[PDB]
Amino acid sequence: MPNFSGNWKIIRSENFEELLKVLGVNVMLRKIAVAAASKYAVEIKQEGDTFYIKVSTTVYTTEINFKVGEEFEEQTVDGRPCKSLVKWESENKMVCEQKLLKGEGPKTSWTKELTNDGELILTMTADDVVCTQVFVRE
Ligand SMILES: *C/C(=C/c1ccc(O)cc1)C(=O)OC
């Protein structure tokens, strides 16, 4: 039965560069990252509240596994390791709060939501800045 499970392809990406700026990435790498972002693909497998997620671009791929409600280790958008915890906020929206393994830095979070119109919306937050990325089924 339809849930977050599937193969998703990005169609829109708002404020990605601004987010990277907040995370201290230099302009030239930001521009390359924006260009790289238009090939973001996401593969999800969901059973109950257990999730497998693989995000990839042209040259890079990362996988996470989590159970809602259970702390796990992942990276921030700028590849610093963090402790993560995901909770539901409604039937098809989840919110992840993150804490840096080492160091100090901006407060980062992310959300994933399946909409009525069959889109996947990712938001990624760093301090004051919110990046939104919209995906549709392949
Ligand atoms: C699901 C997910 C995907 C993602 C998208 C863009 C970038 O840059 C990293 C990761 C996520 O939870 O990331 C925060």
From Swiss-Prot:
All-trans-retinoate binds at Q133, V134, F135. Its main location: cytoplasm. A motif (Nuclear localization signal) lies at residues 21-31. Pfam families: Lipocalin. The keyword Nucleus applies. Keywords: Cytoplasm, Endoplasmic reticulum, Isopeptide bond, Nucleus, Retinol-binding, Transport, Ubl conjugation, Vitamin A. Transports retinoic acid to the nucleus. Regulates the access of retinoic acid to the nuclear retinoic acid receptors. Forms a beta-barrel structure that accommodates hydrophobic ligands in its interior. Interacts with RXR and RARA. Interacts with importin alpha. This is Cellular retinoic acid-binding protein 2.
